[PDB]
Amino acid sequence: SMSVKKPKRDDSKDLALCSMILTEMETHEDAWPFLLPVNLKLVPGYKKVIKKPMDFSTIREKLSSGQYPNLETFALDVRLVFDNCETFNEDDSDIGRAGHNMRKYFEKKWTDTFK
């Protein structure tokens, strides 16, 4: 509360570390569905159904341009990629499986880096 602060968690490496995590996700073999925005002209249903589209290139641009106020808003966008994927794709599709694999991969790196 006013003039009463919890001790300062060192966040000075957060930007670099999120950037490293994102690099790892970008270079994963199962990242291919997620590297660019889903083409809304060519994928019927996507525009209407997925209210907040997100992809790795869009996270990378946001990260490089100071549009994440903190490491939690970065994690929210990464999870949004996977949440969108599950909303739109059957679990037993290549894309559906890729999205589960990538979410697992991400969450481990997130835990090991920050928890």
From Swiss-Prot:
Places the protein is found: Nucleus
Tissue/organ expression: Expressed at varying levels in several tissues, whereas a smaller transcript was expressed specifically in testis.
Signal peptide (from-to): none
Transmembrane segments: none
Domain Bromo: 9-113
Quaternary data: Component of the BRF-1 ISWI chromatin remodeling complex, at least composed of SMARCA1 and BAZ2B, which regulates the spacing of histone octamers on the DNA template to facilitate access to DNA. Within the BRF-1 ISWI chromatin remodeling complex interacts with SMARCA1; the interaction is direct. Component of the BRF-5 ISWI chromatin remodeling complex, at least composed of SMARCA5/SNF2H and BAZ2B, which regulates the spacing of histone octamers on the DNA template to facilitate access to DNA.
Recorded family membership: Belongs to the WAL family.
Biological role stated in the UniProt entry: Regulatory subunit of the ATP-dependent BRF-1 and BRF-5 ISWI chromatin remodeling complexes, which form ordered nucleosome arrays on chromatin and facilitate access to DNA during DNA-templated processes such as DNA replication, transcription, and repair. Both complexes regulate the spacing of nucleosomes along the chromatin and have the ability to slide mononucleosomes to the center of a DNA template. The BRF-1 ISWI chromatin remodeling complex has a lower ATP hydrolysis rate than the BRF-5 ISWI chromatin remodeling complex.
Record protein name field: Bromodomain adjacent to zinc finger domain protein 2B
UniProt organism field: Homo sapiens
Gene name, Swiss-Prot/TrEMBL: BAZ2B
Covered range of the whole protein: 2054 to 2166 of 2168
